[PDB]
Structure formats: structure tokens, C-alpha cells
């Protein structure tokens, strides 16, 4: 019924209905290949979790994903196609495979290239759609980097994981300094990408999380003292020991040169000037963003405002996970 393809240093024993498996997934949460679903005649993505269970951690990180994928559903989020196991029983049960849609590639490069507001503002619009949905599902990503935001030739955008759940330049100050983070936390990440999409290069580089915070203040602008206090004891010092960096304006930061129908480019700046706000408490919100005149264009209630998704010993997991791969 199943067949085994040896991919790299691990045998991938999937359903015969999947051919041409090719590894593209060199991620840590699992190995993901690109197969072909002969029973739909379409490109899918198969990810194998080798013995998800083996330690309280993994079994949970895995149990998380499984669950999420089953109830999370949006056109801008990596949709599930099929979870199965070759193991015949809970006994021998010890390997989980998830099939889900196959996208053409993440934003890692497309961003460099030059895209019109139409394609840009849009791709963005789509991200707020998944993110928002994700959010409306007690889920906040945190780890939003173009490295995990896949796109398709038809200009379709989707999200790969749920990242953290409860390459570093795309995280927000609340995580950098380590502090309270709200839902609008993932707005910082988007902000960067958009900029890093216009700038044509990482908005905030930095060799370390320190040199990271430094280049962000420098560039953006020193946290008005009120916020400074919200900082932990040692990190507050640091900032307070640094020169006066009133940053720059969004006009000089993102010059008109980087842009290409004439106001749109400054209309898009107004958004950045509300997405790139270090003080988390003054940073724009997904809702507000979708309403922004730069994104609103593409708005659509069916998409934007979607209906919310849904709601232990080692052995207990194996049983759980299995029970999960078995509900099909």
C-alpha cells in the first residue's frame, strides 16, 4: 500500500500516491520534500516527523502542529492536505507525515527584485489576512521572516508555520529586549519585510541582538523616555548610556527613489510610519492595517474577516499524536 523512498539520511515511507519526492525542507522541525499527488495530479509538500514522541518537548511541539493544521484554515496560511502514518498500530506507531500544499518559494529573494505597489501592497494585504486569522485563533507567530513566507507564481501568498507559539532581524523589540508582547507584535515583522522590500536590503542588520537594538534606535529613533522605563533593569541602562539618536524621518529613511500612482508611494510610507514603532503600544494593528488606504484597496471580508478556526507521559503522547494522525 505504501512505498519507501530514501531521501538523504532517512527513509521516507509514504503513500504510493506520492512520487517524485525531493527534499527542500532542511528545517529542524522536520524534513520536507516536494512530491506529486498522482491522485489529484498536483504538487504537494510532504513533511516527516521522525518519532515526534521521544521527549516531552518534541511530542508536544508535534502535537501542537498537528492540532493547529487540522483546525486552522485560510487561503493565506499553509493548508493541510493529509496527515498519515505507515505504522499499522499504536504499538509500532512511531512516524508521522503531513501533506500540505506546495508553494513556489519564500520571500527571501522576491523582495530584492522590483515590484509595483499593486503586487507589493497586495502581497502585504495577504499577509495581514493570514496573520489576522492566525491571531483570531489565539495564535501569535512572533517568528515572521520572509524565510518562512511562501509565495506562488500566481502572486499568491501564504504562511508556513506558527513559528514560536505559546534571521533575527525580523523579530520585534518586545522579543529582542524580552518583554510583554501583544497581538500587534507580528506587525513589527511585517513592517521590516515591507521596508526590507523597498529598501532592497535588511532594514535592521546587526551582528548581535545588541548591535541589533542599536541599529534600530539609531535608524528609527530613541524610545521616548516613558517607554525606556518599561525596560528591564540592565537593558534600560544600556540604552540610557547611548548617544542621542532621534533617528530619521520616513521621508529620508525610505526615499521616493526606492519607489515607482504618485501618492501611493507616500501612502505606503504613512503605513510604515505606523508599523515600525518600537514602543509596541503605539504600533499599528492588523485591523487598522487592513483599513489603511494602502492596503484597503484589496480588502475583502470573506478573506480578511474570516471565521475563527477552533479550540503527560511519553506514552500518553504517542497515543495522543496517533489518535490525531488517525482522525485523518
Amino acid at each position: 500500500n505504501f512505498y519507501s523512498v530514501e531521501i538523504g539520511d532517512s527513509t521516507f515511507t509514504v503513500l504510493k500516491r506520492y512520487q517524485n519526492l525531493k527534499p527542500i525542507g532542511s528545517g529542524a522541525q522536520g524534513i520536507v520534500c516536494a512530491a506529486y499527488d498522482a491522485i489529484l495530479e498536483r504538487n504537494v509538500a510532504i513533511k516527516k516527523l521522525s518519532r515526534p514522541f521521544q521527549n516531552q518537548t518534541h511530542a508536544k511541539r508535534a502535537y501542537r502542529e498537528l492540532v493547529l493544521m487540522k483546525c486552522v484554515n485560510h487561503k493565506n496560511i499553509i493548508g493541510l492536505l493529509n496527515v498519515f502514518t505507515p505504522q499499522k498500530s499504536l504499538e509500532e506507531f512511531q512516524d508521522v507525515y503531513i501533506v500540505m500544499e506546495l508553494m513556489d518559494a519564500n520571500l527571501c529573494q522576491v523582495i530584492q527584485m522590483e515590484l509595483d505597489h499593486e503586487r507589493m501592497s497586495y502581497l502585504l494585504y495577504q499577509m495581514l489576512c493570514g496573520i489576522k486569522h492566525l491571531h483570531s485563533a489565539g495564535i501569535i507567530h512572533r517568528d515572521l521572516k520572509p524565510s518562512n513566507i511562501v509565495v506562488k507564481s500566481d502572486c499568491t501568498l501564504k504562511i508556513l508555520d506558527f513559528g514560536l507559539a505559546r534571521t533575527r532581524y525580523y523579530r520585534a523589540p518586545e522579543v529582542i529586549l524580552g518583554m510583554g508582547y501583544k497581538e500587534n507584535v507580528d506587525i513589527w515583522s511585517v513592517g521590516c519585510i515591507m521596508g526590507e522590500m523597498i529598501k532592497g536590503g535588511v532594514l535592521f542588520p546587526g551582528t548581535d541582538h545588541i548591535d541589533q537594538w542599536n541599529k534600530v534606535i539609531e535608524q528609527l529613533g530613541t524610545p521616548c523616555p516613558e517607554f525606556m522605563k518599561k525596560l528591564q533593569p540592565t537593558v534600560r541602562t544600556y540604552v540610557e548610556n547611548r548617544p542621542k539618536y532621534a533617528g530619521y524621518s520616513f521621508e529620508k529613511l525610505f526615499p521616493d527613489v526606492l519607489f515607482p500612482n504618485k501618492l501611493k508611494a507616500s501612502q505606503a510610507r504613512d503605513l510604515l510610519s505606523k508599523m515600525l514603532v518600537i514602543d509596541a503600544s503605539k504600533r499599528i494593528s492588523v485591523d487598522e492595517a487592513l483599513q489603511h488606504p494602502y492596503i484597503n484597496v484589496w480588502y475583502d471580508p470573506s478573506e480578511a474577516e474570516a471565521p475563527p478556526p477552533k479550540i503527560h507521559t511519553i506514552e500518553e503522547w504517542k497515543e495522543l499524536i496517533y489518535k490525531e494522525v488517525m482522525d485523518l
Partner: peptide, 10 residues
């Protein structure tokens, strides 16, 4: 405003 049905990854 017809949504872009093309994206150049290459």
C-alpha cells in the same frame, strides 16, 4: 482594481 495574477520569482 484587478488583483495581480503574475509574480516574477526568477
Amino acid at each position: 482594481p484587478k488583483r495581480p495574477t503574475t509574480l516574477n520569482l526568477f
